[PDB]
Design a protein around this ligand. Structure first.
Ligand SMILES: CC(C)CCC[C@@H](C)[C@H]1CC[C@H]2[C@@H]3CC=C4C[C@@H](O)CC[C@]4(C)[C@H]3CC[C@]12C
Lengths: 84, 451, 32, 380
């Protein structure tokens, strides 16, 4: 019941906040160390928010061979206790 | 059920569950049967993020338990260093007293929490506040045998608050959340440090636009002059903070305010070569001919710093090219004294007089020859500076150069046709000066010439 | 480290009150 | 987590009272009662009791702010351990007939735990010590019963291995605990405890000897070996110290060196010169352990373990004089050490449980965790 319909990266707003609006309004360009906002859309209404939050993690990878030791891959949960 | 679950989440550090409960409508100021709210429980268990979030959601910071304990009391007794730092950063009263008279410093001292004791002492905790039994933090530390706490308490004594006020700290980090909480608690945005500076001064120093806007919107004085006379506009102009200068000018900062030494913001901008700031100040009516206590105009400051483009901009804005200080120093005199031949070129090309006299009759050529500034020398002699000008004492440039022993200056002066047989007020030739100062090479070149 | 700027002495040194004063107009008289 | 201790107002009283009620019920259901040398036989057990309470409780009181806990917790552990040891030696060596000899043997079982607790005192609360007492007494009884079943020795006579069992059990439990000092007056009190232990250790070296001549010879050997070990320990302390001074902490334990060295063989040493040689060698080994073991938590417990091993080795060397017996005795020692280490692992993992409300590692060796003091802020 946690299917994903779409994810909006909000390229215009984030690029405005991250001083990359001159680059594009469609591609997400962000600068490290500063938060950016995305919107996750679900196919069905989410009944219980906390178990669903416990059920989801995010992974960011860069390069052809991403790994933790190279710091080219990070897996982090979606929670208010995350290291900002 | 909802409030009890919120308190359980606050105890366990389940920030997601507590935030969900707060979103549902749970009163954030709810407490258990012991009078411990969510902030108290989070401070007990050391949940820093939960403490910060609850402070951001407007929890009453000085709420006491049934024992009179604030959150800072509980964090100090529990020895939660990060929680103590965060609570103090958000404006916790370090000298709060429970019903039995205990202070946070007493609780940290009795529990042998050295780091908490030191942090509270640096934040102005009074170690002389006694309990209802008459015991001090030192007394309980002595009774419990906490030797390190006893030693630190004795060594600190009554030095007092050596940390900045919390609003100054927030302004330094451009932290709008902590500043908002602090100003919600204490409505005075002009809190003074021991040096006399407001948080607006710090925000202007670091160009922290967001916290500066917040402070100005909460009633901070844009024109707060301390005893030294350094307004936030002075600081922003000195630091080259263009956007801060524009913001402060828009909020009513005065353009003509003087420091203790009568420095205007234009003086600070020109001293550090901030061309855009100088143009902004001039367009707002800053007096280009304002003088300091020593009679220095901003063109003097720009020439002193080798700030070529600032000199150019000031000259374009009708600055007086031959303005004199109290020592009758022109900007050309300053450029010769500091060896800035580019500034001298700009000044001479714009019509500065090459033979201006200082108080002791020194020309820019005399000063350039004194300081071995050969490029300024060639530039002055190229633009009609007298090679035989004398001071009040009758010193020629060759006299000065021979006394200082600057061989290239002497060589160039004699090659351009300076007589080595000129005399001072006392009959003293350049060879006399070279002999007196023991410059064998200068004297040898003089004697090889017609001296 | 990373917290020295929270103290009054370090903030005083950072703000550089001496940079807002007219230091001197040196002459360095040639005679003595 | 909070460095302020959690309230034990519900855990400790319930635990202690339930233990005492269970002990009383077991004594009612399983224990039963029953001359010229009544006082003489009572004195040996009394001497063991004096050592267990006074010497062991005060020997560990040397800590700056942990003397109360050392003394009182040792008393509590002795009181629990003797009762539980009476029941356990009753269960594994047959109803339980209670005699002065059984009380003496139960006291020895309790002193094994009391020795082991020195490696963990200052890092645990009372409930953890209760768990340690119960599990260690049970493990020592199990080891003795296993040795009786395999090597056909008496269950009560197998209590000779209690030095080495206690040393390795304590070291293991201490190794399992989370990772983290002296004062003059607690040092003098610890010297009082060490002096009583040193003075009455010949009563440790012959409770289990039925014959009078064996008791006589063992007592003589222990006395002379202890004298030699005291002299060697005090003299050689300056060598094994960075500042070339005598360490009171080192002396407090190194005085017992010769007694431990001859503990399992004092009845077989035929002349006092051999016991004196063993005491001298024990003192020299104590010097070397003080100087070398810290390079490679409690150093005094480490040299105690080394000395117990050395006592077992000299028992092996002497038992041949008075090679299959060598193999049997080596297997006995290896089984004893293996069971000690395994039960120590189990005890340490049990002690690490959250429910015991153990002191924070920043609050180790501090009486304020467990004891009431005036002019303190209490609670939240
Ligand atoms: C025992 C074997 C033979 C068959 C058992 C399969 C049944 C019990 C399992 C297998 C897959 C499971 C489903 C997997 C995913 C979801 C989505 C979740 O949001 C609601 C429950 C639901 C719909 C599960 C219901 C139970 C389920 C149908």
């Amino acid at each position: 019941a946690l299917g994903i319909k779409s994810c909006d990266f909000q390229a215009a707003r984030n690029n405005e906040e991250h001083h990359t609006k001159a680059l594009s309004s469609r591609r997400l360009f962000v600068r490290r160390g500063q938060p950016f906002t995305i919107i996750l859309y679900f196919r069905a209404p989410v009944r219980a928010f906390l178990p669903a939050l416990k059920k989801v993690a995010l992974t960011a990878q860069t390069g052809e061979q991403p790994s933790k030791i190279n710091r080219t891959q990070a897996t982090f949960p979606i929670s208010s206790l995350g290291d900002r | 059920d909802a409030a009890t679950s919120f308190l359980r989440a606050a105890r366990s550090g389940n920030l997601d569950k507590a935030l969900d409960h707060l979103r549902n409508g749970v009163d954030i100021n709810t407490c258990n049967q012991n009078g411990l709210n969510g902030l108290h429980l989070a401070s007990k268990e050391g949940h820093v993020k939960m403490v910060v979030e609850l402070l951001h959601k407007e929890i009453i910071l000085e709420t006491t338990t049934k024992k009179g304990n604030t959150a800072l009391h509980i964090a100090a007794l529990a020895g939660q260093d990060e929680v103590v730092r965060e609570l103090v950063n958000y404006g916790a009263n370090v000298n709060a007293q429970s019903q039995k008279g205990f202070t946070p410093l007493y609780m940290a001292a009795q529990e042998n929490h050295l780091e908490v004791v030191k942090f509270l002492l640096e934040n102005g905790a009074n170690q002389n506040v006694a309990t209802e039994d008459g015991f001090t933090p030192l007394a309980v530390a002595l009774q419990q045998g906490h030797e390190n706490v006893v030693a630190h308490l004795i060594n600190y004594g009554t030095k007092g608050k050596v940390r900045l006020p919390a609003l100054h700290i927030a302004a330094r980090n451009d932290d709008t959340r902590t500043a908002a909480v602090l100003l919600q608690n204490d409505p005075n945005p002009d809190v003074l440090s021991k040096t006399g500076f407001t948080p607006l001064h710090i925000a202007a120093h670091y160009e922290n636009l967001n916290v500066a806007q917040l402070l100005l919107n909460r009633g901070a004085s844009v024109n707060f002059t301390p005893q030294n006379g350094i307004t936030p506009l002075h600081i922003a102009s000195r630091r080259g903070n263009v956007i801060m200068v524009r913001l402060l000018l828009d909020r009513g900062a005065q353009i003509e305010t003087k420091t203790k030494d009568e420095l205007t913001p234009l003086h600070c901008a020109a001293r550090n070569g901030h061309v855009r700031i100088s143009e902004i100040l001039l367009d707002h009516g800053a007096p280009i001919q304002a003088k300091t206590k020593n009679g220095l105009s901003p063109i003097h400051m720009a020439a002193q710093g080798d700030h070529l483009d600032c000199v150019r901009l000031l000259l374009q804005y009708d600055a007086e090219i031959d303005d004199i200080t109290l020592d009758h120093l022109t900007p050309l005199h300053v450029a010769a004294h500091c060896g800035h031949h580019r500034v001298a070129k700009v000044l001479l090309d714009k019509g500065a007089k090459p033979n201006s006299r200082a108080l002791n009759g020194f020309t820019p050529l005399h000063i350039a020859c004194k300081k071995n500034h050969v490029r300024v020398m060639e530039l002055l002699l190229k633009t009609g500076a007298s090679i035989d000008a004398v001071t009040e004492s009758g010193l020629t440039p060759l006299h000065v150069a021979s006394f200082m022993g600057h061989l290239p200056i002497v060589k160039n002066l004699l090659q351009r046709g300076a007589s080595p047989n000129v005399s001072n007020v006392k009959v003293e030739t350049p060879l006399h000066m070279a002999a007196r100062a023991g410059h064998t090479e200068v004297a040898k070149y003089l004697l090889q010439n017609k001296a | 480290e990373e917290l020295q700027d929270d103290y009054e002495d370090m903030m005083e040194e950072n703000l550089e009150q001496e940079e807002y004063e007219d230091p001197d107009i040196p002459e360095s008289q040639m005679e003595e | 987590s909070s460095k302020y201790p959690r309230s034990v107002r519900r855990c400790l009283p319930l635990w202690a009272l339930t233990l005492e009620a269970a002990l009383i019920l077991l004594f009612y259901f399983f224990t039963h009662y029953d001359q010229k040398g009544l006082v003489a036989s009572y004195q040996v057990g009394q001497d063991l009791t004096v050592m267990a309470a006074l010497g062991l409780g005060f020997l560990t009181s040397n800590f700056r702010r942990h003397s109360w806990s050392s003394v009182a917790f040792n008393l509590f552990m002795l009181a629990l351990g003797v009762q539980w040891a009476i029941l356990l030696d009753g269960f594994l060596s047959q109803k339980v007939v209670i005699t002065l000899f059984s009380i003496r043997l139960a006291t020895m079982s309790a002193m094994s735990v009391l020795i082991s607790a020195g490696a963990v005192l200052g890092k645990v609360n009372l409930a953890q010590l209760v768990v340690m007492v119960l599990v260690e007494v049970t493990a020592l009884g199990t080891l003795r019963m296993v040795i009786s079943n395999i090597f056909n020795t008496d269950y009560h006579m197998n209590l000779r291995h209690f030095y080495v069992f206690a040393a390795y059990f304590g070291l293991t439990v201490a190794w399992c605990l989370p990772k983290p000092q002296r004062a003059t007056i607690p040092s003098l009190s610890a010297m009082l405890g060490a002096l009583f232990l040193w003075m009455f250790w010949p009563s440790v070296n012959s409770p289990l000897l039925r014959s009078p001549i064996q008791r006589k010879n063992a007592m003589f050997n222990t006395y002379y070996a202890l004298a030699v070990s005291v002299v060697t320990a005090i003299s050689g302390s300056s060598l094994a110290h960075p500042q070339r001074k005598i360490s009171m902490t080192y002396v407090h334990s190194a005085v017992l060196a010769g007694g431990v060295a001859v503990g399992t063989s004092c009845h077989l040493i035929p002349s006092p010169w051999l016991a004196m040689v063993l005491g001298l060698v024990a003192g020299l080994i104590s010097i070397g352990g003080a100087k070398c073991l810290p390079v490679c938590i409690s150093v005094m417990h480490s040299i105690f373990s080394l000395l117990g091993l050395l006592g077992e080795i000299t028992y092996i060397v002497l038992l041949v004089l008075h090679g299959f017996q060598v193999l049997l005795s080596i297997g006995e020692l290896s089984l004893a050490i293996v069971i000690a280490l395994t039960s120590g692992l189990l005890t340490g993992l049990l002690l690490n449980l959250k429910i015991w409300k153990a002191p924070h590692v920043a609050k180790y060796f501090d009486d304020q965790v467990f004891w009431k003091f005036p002019h303190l802020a209490v609670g939240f």
